[PDB]
């Protein structure tokens, strides 16, 4: 399967009470596995899945050093950008960063990325070629110049194409139990009729991993249906995910609708009629 | 967590 690791950074400024809150978190596929919080007592980079506690103290020191440094650049940036956006010292602004690796089924490098947002809006992000930069506006343009000068792309490419991928493989190899697991969904249907002519059908799918899924309502015949509800996939809390797609039909013809389901942990795609 | 390529803005 295709596999990805990612890091997300966030720094909110708290003018007049403390230094910027800073929160880093790391993921492999849809699984969180490290974190840092500027406000947590430990002041280290802490583990968040079994297979990472395996790593020795040399690691944790390392990742801490790394993460703290991010923290600082974000602390400066918050300052710079006030200047650039001509904003006052009062009130709080967010800066966010995110980068990572993808790899294909062969576990070979597929694509890299690294982006940066300010107050919730894109600021500067690295193109797919790992060489060029898109920038929002005349502030971003200032940075793009600064970063072109210092070959930040060249340095990043190194990491993204090199070490970031190497570690993803290392993790995918230690993680087998958890990361290459592929839990199929436990599904049921539910018949809630709005009285008389109405009738709606909810096609539940619980306890799956990873979150990528596709459930789609059909008539007997042609497939698509645009007049259907579905909720964003949601975290169970125990490591798996949940989703359902409702649709509305008459209180005749209940059993002529079939809900097809497509997940990576299902060999053949499921399908489901009405039970009774 | 990257080791290089992380500069200010």
């Amino acid at each position, epitope marked *: 399967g295709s596999h990805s690791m990612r890091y997300f950074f966030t720094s909110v400024s708290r003018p007049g009470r403390g230094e910027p809150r800073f929160i880093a978190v790391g993921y492999v596929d849809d699984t969180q596995f490290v974190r840092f919080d500027s406000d947590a007592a430990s002041q280290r980079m802490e583990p968040r899945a079994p297979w990472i506690e395996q790593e020795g103290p040399e690691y944790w020191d390392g990742e801490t050093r790394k993460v703290k440094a991010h923290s600082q650049t974000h602390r400066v940036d918050l300052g710079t950008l006030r200047g650039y956006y001509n904003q006052s010292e009062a009130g709080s602004h967010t800066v966010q960063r995110m980068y990572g690796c993808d790899v294909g089924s062969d576990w070979r490098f597929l694509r890299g990325y690294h982006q940066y947002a300010y107050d919730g809006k894109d600021y500067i992000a690295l193109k797919e070629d790992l060489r060029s930069w898109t920038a929002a506006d005349m502030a971003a343009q200032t940075t793009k110049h600064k970063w072109e000068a210092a070959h930040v792309a060249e340095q990043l490419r*190194a990491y993204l194409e090199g070490t970031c991928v190497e570690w993803l493989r290392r993790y995918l190899e230690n993680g087998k139990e958890t990361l290459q697991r592929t839990d199929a969904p436990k599904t049921h249907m539910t018949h809630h009729a709005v009285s008389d002519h109405e009738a709606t059908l909810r096609c539940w799918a619980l306890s799956f991993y990873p979150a990528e899924i596709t459930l789609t309502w059909q008539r007997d015949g042609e497939d698509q249906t645009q007049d259907t509800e579905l909720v964003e996939t949601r975290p169970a809390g125990d490591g798996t995910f949940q989703k359902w797609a409702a649709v509305v039909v008459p209180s005749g013809q209940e059993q002529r609708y079939t809900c097809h389901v497509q997940h990576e942990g299902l060999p053949k795609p499921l399908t489901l009629r009405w039970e009774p | 967590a990257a080791g290089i390529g992380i500069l200010t803005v």
Partner: T-cell receptor, first 115, second 108 residues
Framework: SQTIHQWPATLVQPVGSPLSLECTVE??????LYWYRQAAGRGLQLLFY??????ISSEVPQNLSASRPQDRQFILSSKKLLLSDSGFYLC?????????????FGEGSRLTVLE | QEVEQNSGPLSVPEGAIASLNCTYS??????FFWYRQYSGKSPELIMF????GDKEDGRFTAQLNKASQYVSLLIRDSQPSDSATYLC?????????FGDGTTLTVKP
């Protein structure tokens, strides 16, 4: 050295003496700062490093103390020196963040401790 | 042992090619450096390098091979003034760790 100046250049001090070496930097800001040491055999060893003002970090369990009252003022010091503490001490700075790793060095404080 | 570097004096004749070599354990090593250190002086950067291949600056040529985990430095057409200790440094996890250095003597 235009960018980072360090002193005193050279110290002969008896055991149990106090130590204080000072390090200044000019021409960047919010720099990473470093105290390294070149003990009996020419390899640099990291003693302290700092991400920014008032933040210190020790690498080896140490007799020495280090501190940073200011963005660009870096102080290494000791209450009572030992023979062990003889060495060449090098202040260094790098670009705020995690750039290429390039290190710029002071001119060095050379410390001999005597019995 | 984290970063290995033959010490003892290598001697090369003036105008030959000097070659220094460095080795490193930790695979997740991001960037690599040669500094040069003159007797009684602070050390000073010749070169850095952070992806496989060769990088040349004048008489100096760095070589890195992440697969084999080594960084070389060659000095073309060596002068007497190139006699120095050459420290190798490997930046992992936001800290450059240093070799014990190799000492070169260019015999005129």
């Amino acid at each position: 050295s235009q960018t980072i100046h360090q002193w005193p250049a050279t110290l002969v001090q008896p055991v149990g003496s106090p130590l204080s070496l000072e390090c200044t930097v000019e021409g960047t800001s919010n720099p990473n700062l470093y105290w390294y040491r070149q003990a009996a055999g020419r390899g640099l060893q990291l003693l302290f490093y700092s991400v920014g003002i008032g933040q210190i970090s020790s690498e080896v369990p140490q007799n020495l103390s280090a501190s940073r009252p200011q963005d660009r003022q870096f102080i290494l010091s000791s209450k009572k020196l030992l023979l062990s503490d003889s060495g060449f001490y090098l202040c260094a700075w790098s670009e705020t963040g995690l750039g290429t790793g390039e290190l710029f060095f002071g001119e060095g404080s050379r410390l001999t401790v005597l019995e | 042992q984290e970063v290995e570097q033959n010490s003892g004096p290598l001697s090369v004749p003036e105008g030959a090619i000097a070659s220094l070599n460095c080795t490193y354990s930790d695979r997740g090593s991001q960037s690599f450096f040669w500094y040069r250190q003159y007797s009684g002086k602070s050390p000073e950067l010749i070169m850095f390098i952070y992806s496989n291949g060769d990088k040349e600056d004048g008489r100096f040529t760095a070589q890195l091979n992440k697969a084999s985990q080594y960084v070389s430095l060659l000095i073309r057409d060596s002068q007497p003034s190139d006699s120095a200790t050459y420290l190798c440094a490997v930046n992992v996890a936001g800290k450059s760790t240093f070799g014990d250095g190799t000492t070169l003597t260019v015999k005129p």
